[PDB]
# Entry
Amino acid sequence: RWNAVLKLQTLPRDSSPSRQRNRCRQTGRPHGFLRKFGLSRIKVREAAMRGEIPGLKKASW
Amino acid sequence: PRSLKKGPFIDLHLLKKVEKAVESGDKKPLRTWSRRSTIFPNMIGLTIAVHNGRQHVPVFVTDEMVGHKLGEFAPTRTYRGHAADKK
Amino acid sequence: QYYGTGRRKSSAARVFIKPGNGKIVINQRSLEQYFGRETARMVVRQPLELVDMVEKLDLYITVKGGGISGQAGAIRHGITRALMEYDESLRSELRKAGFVTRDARQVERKKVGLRKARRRPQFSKR
Amino acid sequence: RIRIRLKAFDHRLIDQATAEIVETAKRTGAQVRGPIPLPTRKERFTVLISPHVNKDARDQYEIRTHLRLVDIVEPTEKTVDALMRLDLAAGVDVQI
Amino acid sequence: GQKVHPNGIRLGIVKPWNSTWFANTKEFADNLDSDFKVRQYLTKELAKASVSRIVIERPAKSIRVTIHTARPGIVIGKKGEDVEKLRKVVADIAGVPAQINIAEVRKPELDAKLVADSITSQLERRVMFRRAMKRAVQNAMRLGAKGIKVEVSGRLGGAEIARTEWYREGRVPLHTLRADIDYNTSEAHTTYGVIGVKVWIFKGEI
RNA sequence: GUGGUUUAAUUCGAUGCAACGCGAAGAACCUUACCUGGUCUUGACAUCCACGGAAGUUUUCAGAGAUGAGAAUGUGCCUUCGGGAACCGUGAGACAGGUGCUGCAUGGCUGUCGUCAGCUCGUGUUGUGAAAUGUUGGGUUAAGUCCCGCAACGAGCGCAACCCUUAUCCUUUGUUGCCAGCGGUCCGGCCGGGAACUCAAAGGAGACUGCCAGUGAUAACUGGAGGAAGGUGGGGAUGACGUCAAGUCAUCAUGGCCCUUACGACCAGGGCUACACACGUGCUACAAUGGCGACUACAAAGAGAAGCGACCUCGCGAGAGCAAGCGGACCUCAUAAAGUGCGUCGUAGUCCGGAUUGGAGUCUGCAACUCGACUCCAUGAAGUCGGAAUCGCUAGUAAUCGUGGAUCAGAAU
# Structure
C-alpha cells in the first residue's frame, strides 16, 4: 500500500537508518529487486524485452 | 474472451499488505477499495472486504475463488428478493 | 596358472586356468549354479573341448556387468585366450573355430527414421 | 622435484610454452622428465546444423582442455631464474 | 534437387572456418552476433575491392578481422585514409578495440567468391551470360586450376521463362570429400528480376 | 483436428496419400494477428536538418492502466579569441512501416517417385524430318553379367568406393582400470605400486572371390576349405538427367500489386476449454520370460544460481517444513532399467488387474473449474488372451521396461 511504501520517507521510524530497505521503483516489489537498476525481477524483464534498458541484452545459448 | 497471460492486475496496495500479514499466518478482515484486482493464493484464508459503493462486505477468499475479481463477490445493487427468500 | 580376459557386449569375465580336476568357479559359485538352467551355458566350455582339456584343467572365473549371455561369451573368450598362454600351438587349432574373437552387435538405440537403427523403413512396392 | 602441469584450450600454444619451459631448463637444470601429453578432458555439443528441418544434421563440436607434465627435478637457483622472467604464453595456465 | 553446401561439407577437412576463437557458453552469442554485424559493413563498404573472405579471431576483449581483398589499394585509401575510417566507424559497432588487416589476393581468378562477382556484375549490366561464363570458366582455367564450373538460373537474357545455363571445364568432383573446391554465390538485381550466380573452383586434390 | 450446428464475434493458414501435438521447438495481459471501451502522435522502427531551455536522477497529484498534469537535485568534455562534439527533451520540417495479396511472377531451401534408379554424350550409320540405332539377335546370369554373331565403336554422372559409429588384432598414451602380481588394508583400489587387463584417444592392420570342386565363351553363379567377419560383415549422413507447374513470398531474399489518423500505437476487461447430432485421427481397457514384492551387482553421455537439491522430519504421498554441499571430471540430479538370487501364481473377477469414483492434502505456477503431476484414504470395474478388419518384426532381433538429451522462464504420453 501507499502506506507500506514508507521507505520513500528518508527519515526512518524508531529504527536506525538501517531500517530503510529498497522497494522497486516501477512496481514497488520489495521481494526480489536488483540494486543496480533498482527494479524488481518482474520489471527488469519487461523493461528488457522493450529495450528501454540501455546496455542490457537477452543472453542466448 | 478473458485474458491475463503473465500480467495479472493486482493493485500494488492491496497486494503489499496481504503479504505483510503472511509474516505469521493471517490477519483479521481487511478492507480494499479497488475491486479491479484479482484473487490469488496469498489471499487464501483471509477475509477481504470489498466496497460495494456504500459499505465494505466481508468476502472469505477460497482456493475455488482464486482467479476471479473481488468485485465479482461484491454485488452492487440490492434486490430484496421479494419473497420467502428460501435457499 | 594362466589368465584370460574375455570381452563381449558389456561384460568382462576373467579366466584363471589351473591344472586340476575340471570344476570351475563362477563368482564363488559352481558352473551349473550360476548358469542355472540355460541351454547356452554349454558354449562357455566349448574352447576346452576342441583342445580337449576340462577333465585336465580347473578354472576360476570372475565376471561382472552385462547379462548372463554376454558373460557366457565373455568367459569363453577368456578361457580361449587363456589356453593360448598354456601352449601357443593351440592357436593353430583353437583359432580355427573362432573362439579367440569377441563380437560387435552391441545393442544400439533404434535410430530414428528407421526401426532397428539398422533396418530402414522399406517402401511399399513402387 | 617441481611438477609443472600446463593446461589450455588451444593445442599449439601449449607445445610452444611447454617446450620453452623445458629447453630453458635443459641448460641450468636437469634434462627434465620430458613433457608428456596426458589424458585430455573433452566436452562435445551436438546441435543441428541447419536451423529449419533436417533433424539428422547435428554437427559435432568440442572444447578440449589439454594438459602437460614436464616435471623438472634437481632444481637450481638459475633453474628458476629462467622461468620467473620469461613468460610468453597467455592462453596457458601454469601450475608449479 | 540440390547438393550439400561444399564449403560446409568440407569444413572438417581442407576448408577452415570464417571465425576461429575459444569457447564461451554465455558469450558465444554476443561474439557471433558481433561477427555477423561486422561482416555486414565489410560486405558493403568493402564491395568495390573484391572481398573474398573475412576471417575472424577473438582473444580476451579484441578482434583481428583479416579481410582478404584482391585490390587492397582501394581498401587502404589515399595514403592509408580509408583504413583509418573503417577501424573507427567499425569501433562504433563494438566499443571493443578491434584490429584490421588487408592481405591481398594473388590473381582473383582462383577465388570463387570473386569469380561470382565478376559474372553478376556483367549480368547486372546487360551482356550475353554464356559469354561471361564461357570466359570466366576460361579465366579460372587459364590461370591454372584443375576444374571450374559456373551456373546461372533466373530469367537469362530477360526471357519470360527462367533458364539455367551450365558449361564447365576440368574436374569438379563435389562428392569427393577432399577435392577442396572453393565455392561462391553472388546475387544480382535486375529490371526483369533477380538472379543468382554459382561458380566452383577446384584447385589441387589435397 | 474437421464437417455440421450454433454464435455478436471463440484469428489465420494446412486438408486423400504429400491436412489433422501440422507451422505455435510451449496461446492464462506479451507472442495474437481476435473483440468492447478509454487514449496518443515524427509518434513501436530508419535517415537527416533547423531550434530557447537542452545530458542525467529522484518524487508528487489523478487513474483500471495508459496517459496527462506537476515539483525538485544539476555538467564534465573539445577550446576561450569565439565557441563547440555527444546523448537527450520540446516545437517545426523532410520522412517511416506491412506475416496485406500473389510462390503458376521467382531466388533460396525442402519434400516426393528415390536413394528408386538408370540417366546422357562424341562419332558413324538410317530417315526429308521430329528422331532411331548404339543398350537388336543366339546361349546364360541376380543384373546391358559377360561372350558369339554382330552398323556400331567408345566415353562421362548413378550405384559402389571415399567419411563416421559398432567388432578381430597391433602400435602410441593413460590420476579410467586391476593383488592380473606383491605388500598394507578402518579390507571402501582405499593406499603403496605397476600398466597387463577394461576403458579412453589417435594411427594402422584385414576379403580381393585369392584358393579348391561343378557349370559357363566369360562375367559370374552354386558348393567347400581356410578365416574374427565375406560377396556391398551391421549402420549412419547423403536423395541424380528429370517428375508432380508438389510445399513455402509468417525463416529469409525477391518482381508486381495493394494501404498512411488510419487494415498504425498504448492500455483495462471479457477467450481460444458453445451443442440435439455426424466423422477422421489417437489415448485409456482388462498379468504371471511379460509383472509384481523384496534383495542385490554393472554404463555412457549431459545438466545445475536461485537452480540441481544430499540428509532429517510429516505423509502406504506428491511434495512439503527444515537444511548441508558443489558452482561442479572433487555436491546434487542417479535409483540405470533389465539382469542375479528368492518367493508368489497356472485363468477361481480370488491382495491376482488396476480403471473409475468419493474424501483429505502438498506443490510448480501471479493461476491450474474447464488442463496438471503425484499420492495419503476408501472404492475397486472391464478381463481369464476380446465382433467385421488391420499393423510392426526375423537373432540379441521382435514384444516389453526404465533412463537421458535437443527445443525450453514454464505445462516434453
